[PDB]
Design a binder for this molecule. Structure first.
Ligand SMILES: [Cl-]
Ligand SMILES: [Cl-]
Ligand SMILES: [Cl-]
Ligand SMILES: [Cl-]
Lengths: 303, 297
């Protein structure tokens, strides 16, 4: 990268700045074999995969991308409908990025916001995917449908960060380090930062220290309250199911299981889905790296 | 800070939980007015004079708000539950010899008010609540649309110190954004600038902001459970009641306010006022006449 004091958490992996019509996508690229794209979420960057990507690179050509607007990827200017940070637009952009590498059909694993890009990609463009894995999420529509007093208090940030600009931007900008560390710790099993490599945390903190990066994150959640929700509602009410073979992995103490049985939910959205919990909080690839890596290796390797 | 209550004195009223500050004016039957979030007693400055033409008007800062003392909170946020606040204000009124009085409240103060009516109806001759539904009714309506509309009910109720830390960055911005965004105009032009300064100065103290978060923590937990018991018991406020709400306020957002209150009260009348949330400042003339006519009748 271009940040002198941030650590290289993928020894041996190359680096790519991939041009697209919507801006550059940064990625680390390693391994060889069938192509597998990995997508991080909030409030993280591509380095969240640093503990599982080497194991995956033993069997796949692994592409670890920063989401549009996150990490070192470019930050398109948003609009009144939060368009570039909708999962539909993010998926189109990452499809464009993968074509630049010559990948028109690939395997895909996503976590948190990246998992939302991933199932939206499967709904809009299923021919692009051989197999899909989503980590510690339910569909955005399903989160909102479960909204009640208990859900609103337990996962408040969906409604907070979706408030009109500049309300979340100005609240997060007073003490950004405290917020990003608080969010990282609060979703782990133990409720502290012990699950994370401190060098990865510094990546997350430096990203969050940029007000333009924080604005993108709020736009992500604004799309998640509005367009993404409207997009999802159209699919579930039409009975559209993802046909791509799918794996749902969630943490036993994560977000997706808060008030739902995740595999039953995903069977409503996908016609060929398997799933398993893992004893972990929300951050599966850092809290339970070996079990996550093995589940992904076995799923993506299965004939 | 400006004096916005001509002809009103200023009183510090002792209670077992700390002092209650109040402006006091007028003569005649006693009437207590209770403000809400993020304001102080000065929010009544445009209607209290007309009320003081007929009543002894007592304009109090809520426990922990404005210039009233801040009792220490606990793990169930007890002193800032509306049941506790009502008890403390009942004590303050007894210091003045008022054991039967009329009551009007707005926002948090309206929640103190209907809880007071449910707990101790003998204290009230009449009750007015401005731009609210019962706390239980907000939470039962907390779907996607409402969670986005009143996000602060969940945000300010997050465990300390998350909202405290975020509010400390730019407190002037937050109090001004809450005031502006709930009015019809969406700016601060409906408020007297001197009144806004009162609100800003109070919000500038981290101890006052913590109390407000404890208030919203009570609203998500104990207050909700207290309301739920009354719902399950079929309890209705027997005190004659007035529900005023802004046509573009919060109470009307996801519900029909008079239909809701008639499930909570056996003798309630009401009307919308063309106004956002802050009835006594956005629409002082219509609010004052409605209140005068109700508390005289
Ligand atoms: Cl480098
Ligand atoms: Cl998410
Ligand atoms: Cl979820
Ligand atoms: Cl309120």
């Amino acid at each position: 990268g271009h940040m002198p004091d941030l650590a290289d958490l993928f020894p041996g992996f190359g680096s790519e700045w991939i041009n697209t019509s919507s801006g550059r996508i940064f990625a680390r690229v390693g391994g060889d074999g069938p192509p597998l794209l990995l997508l991080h979420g909030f409030p993280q960057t591509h380095v969240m995969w640093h503990r599982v990507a080497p194991k995956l690179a033993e069997r796949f050509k692994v592409i670890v991308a920063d989401l549009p607007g996150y990490g070192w990827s470019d930050m398109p200017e948003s609009d009144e409908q939060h368009t570039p940070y909708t999962k539909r637009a993010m998926a189109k952009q990452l499809i464009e990025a993968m074509e630049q590498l010559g990948h028109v059909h690939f395997a895909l694993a996503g976590h948190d916001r990246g998992a939302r890009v991933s199932y939206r990609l499967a709904l809009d463009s299923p021919g692009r995917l051989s197999k899909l894995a989503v980590l510690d999420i339910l569909p955005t529509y399903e989160y909102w449908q479960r909204m009640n007093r208990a859900y609103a208090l337990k996962i408040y940030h969906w409604s907070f960060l979706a408030q009109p600009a500049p309300l979340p931007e100005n609240l997060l900008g007073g003490d950004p380090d405290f917020y990003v560390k608080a969010k990282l710790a609060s979703w782990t099993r133990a409720g502290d930062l012990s699950a994370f490599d401190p060098r990865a945390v510094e990546h997350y903190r430096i990203a969050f220290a940029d007000p333009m990066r924080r604005h993108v994150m709020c736009e992500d959640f604004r799309a998640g309250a509005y367009a993404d929700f409207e997009h999802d509602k159209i699919d579930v009410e039409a009975g559209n199911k993802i046909p791509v073979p799918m794996l749902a992995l969630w943490g036993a103490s994560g977000i997706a299981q808060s008030a739902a049985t995740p595999l039953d939910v995903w069977r409503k959205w996908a016609s060929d889905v398997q799933g398993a919990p893992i004893e972990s909080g929300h951050f599966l690839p850092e809290e339970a790296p070996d079990q996550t890596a093995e589940a992904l290796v076995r799923f993506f390797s299965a004939a």
